């Protein structure tokens, strides 16, 4: 069985008289879903997968790229030199599931070997028609409303000896994160349970223990755009910047405040050029989520200090979609 | 063919600060990583840190945090490397390199992607002199 | 952390000689993630090989690596006067001390 490379159709439950714009691009581009899905478990039967070098990770990219320039208008954006102008009317904005299958002719296997570290052989291998449901969130720095490790925190990263090797952490335990603009316009800010981020931060340092036994240290980011120095995401159609020095500051041998601003200039992450959308809504503007996972860029540094520092990093959403496809692979049939 | 053209010699005086720049051609400025190497003379070269020009997002090696700043222009496609607090310990040589491509025009590739430490292409270097 | 340890510091030898170089990685690493570099004053260093073995743009077959775990050595089977220069290996972002490859009187 070898792995191919072909166009996955999407499943979702999208809504007729939303005006949503999830709801809206699964009309027309995704089905219904399945209510009785079929797994299927191949008897002694290895397969080698690579998270870091799956197709699907680059389709679905190129679908919420595709969502995103049809849903989320600016008034004005510069791509190059060329200042395209247009209306920018306030949306609803609020992602739903979507199921990745796969065409006939073709299917997807699934490793199910929970202690799998997403790169290499596994043991445990099954067949089904469509990926699980999806929430193609965009975000950096913390990855929000996605699954969860059965048993333990797992790390992964293609190797995490080379520094320039994105870290993809995922949580057993959801971190609520809860962020309001309340009734300057442009200021908001974000909450986090303390007691629960530090047990998140305690069971990740055992697990990086056992890649680096020395003092794992927790820093902000040390530099680049504000998309990528803060946790951003959207939220009510309007973006969020939000500091997270107070999250990624603490030695390992309440309540958490996040601040937060809403910004109209904003650096695109489907390609790169700049984008200004209208000021921001009146009201209240509110986000409840899930912390349910992480992205990690460690130090580097020639020295035999006693220490290693992770800072929270990411910027290339394909990461994102990584941290939910590290599971799937595609296949063609005889 | 790769360019990696840097600016000239710079004698600073100490507590000044100093920025280094490094004009890349030859290939898309979005497509590799950034790196700067440091090296003391007659001293092995040293690792100062990475950059990635999409996000321009960076990772500084442990002992020159607080030290060094790694920045770019995307649209001229050039690179810079800032020093603050200069002292004559920072006297030395510093290069602009790059690994090799990984991706000529794969339709979503990324610096990240690539084997970074190949280093393939250096800059001529630039001194930084160090006095008051 | 991976410290890299080169031998001998200088290797004196003289034209149509052998030259064993040598690098000591402070772990075991893998064969990829080594590679050498050469230096001449007043230039930057040039990439060698890098693969352990895998040669580079005009670099000649003279130039042999070899080596895996802690242990990799480059060779050069008989050494021109173009040759000599400072020596580095280097596994991710750190480098050994160097070795310089020095004219023998």
């Known amino acids: 069985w070898k792995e191919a490379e072909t166009t996955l159709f999407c499943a979702s439950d999208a809504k007729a008289y939303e005006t949503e714009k999830h709801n809206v691009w699964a009309t027309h581009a995704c089905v219904p879903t399945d209510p009785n899905p079929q797994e299927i478990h191949l008897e002694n039967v290895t397969e080698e997968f690579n998270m870091w070098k799956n197709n699907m990770v680059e389709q679905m990219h190129t679908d919420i790229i595709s969502l995103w320039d049809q849903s989320l208008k600016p008034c004005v954006k510069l791509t190059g030199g060329s200042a395209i102008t247009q209306a920018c009317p306030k949306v609803t904005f609020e992602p739903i599931p979507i199921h990745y299958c796969a065409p006939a002719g073709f299917a997807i296997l699934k490793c199910k070997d929970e202690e799998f570290n997403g790169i290499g052989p596994c043991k445990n291998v099954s067949t089904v028609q469509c990926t699980h449901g999806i929430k193609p969130v965009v975000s950096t720095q913390l990855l929000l409303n996605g699954s969860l490790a059965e048993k333990e925190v797992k790390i992964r990263c293609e190797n995490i000896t080379n520094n320039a090797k994105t870290i993809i952490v995922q949580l057993v335990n959801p971190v609520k994160i809860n962020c309001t603009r309340p009734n300057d316009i442009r200021q908001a800010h974000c909450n986090v349970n303390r007691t629960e981020w530090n047990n998140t931060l305690h069971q990740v340092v055992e697990q990086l223990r056992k890649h680096f036994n020395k003092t794992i240290n927790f820093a902000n980011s040390t530099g680049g755009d504000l998309e990528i120095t803060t946790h951003s995401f959207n939220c009510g159609g309007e973006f969020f910047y939000c500091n997270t020095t107070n999250l990624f500051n603490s030695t390992w041998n309440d309540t958490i405040i996040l601040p937060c601003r809403i910004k109209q200039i904003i650096n695109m992450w489907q390609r790169v050029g700049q984008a200004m959308y209208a000021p921001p809504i009146r009201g209240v503007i509110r986000c409840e989520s899930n912390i349910t996972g992480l992205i990690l860029t460690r130090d580097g540094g020639n020295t035999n200090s006693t220490r290693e520092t992770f800072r929270p990093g990411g910027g290339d959403m394909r990461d994102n979609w990584r941290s939910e496809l590290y599971k799937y692979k595609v296949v063609k049939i005889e | 063919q790769h360019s990696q053209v840097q600016s000239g010699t710079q004698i600073k005086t100490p507590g000044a600060s100093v920025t280094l720049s490094c004009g890349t051609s030859?290939?898309?400025?979005?497509?590799?990583?950034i790196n700067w190497v440091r090296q003391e003379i007659g001293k092995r070269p040293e690792w100062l840190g990475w950059?990635?020009?999409?996000?321009?997002?960076?990772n500084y090696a442990q002992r020159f945090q607080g030290k060094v700043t790694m920045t770019r222009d995307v649209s001229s496609g050039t690179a810079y490397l800032t020093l603050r607090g200069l002292t004559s310990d920072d006297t030395a040589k510093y290069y602009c390199v790059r690994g090799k491509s990984c991706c000529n025009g794969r339709r979503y590739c990324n610096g990240a992607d690539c084997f970074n430490w190949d280093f393939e292409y250096w800059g001529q270097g630039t001194l930084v002199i160090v006095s008051p | 952390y991976i410290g890299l340890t080169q031998s001998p510091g200088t290797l004196s030898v003289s034209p149509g000689e052998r030259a064993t170089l040598s690098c000591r990685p402070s772990?075991?690493?893998?064969?990829?993630?080594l590679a050498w570099y050469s230096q001449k004053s007043g230039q930057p260093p040039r990439l060698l090989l890098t693969?352990?073995?895998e040669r580079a743009s005009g670099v000649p077959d003279r130039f042999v690596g070899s080596g895996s775990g802690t242990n990799y050595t480059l060779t050069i089977a008989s050494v021109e006067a173009e040759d000599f220069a400072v020596y580095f290996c280097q596994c991710f972002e750190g480098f050994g001390q160097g070795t310089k490859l020095e004219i023998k009187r």
């Open positions: 772990q075991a690493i893998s064969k990829s993630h």
């Open positions: 693969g352990t073995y």
């Open positions: 030859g290939y898309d400025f979005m497509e590799s990583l």
């Open positions: 950059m990635n020009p999409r996000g321009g997002g960076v």
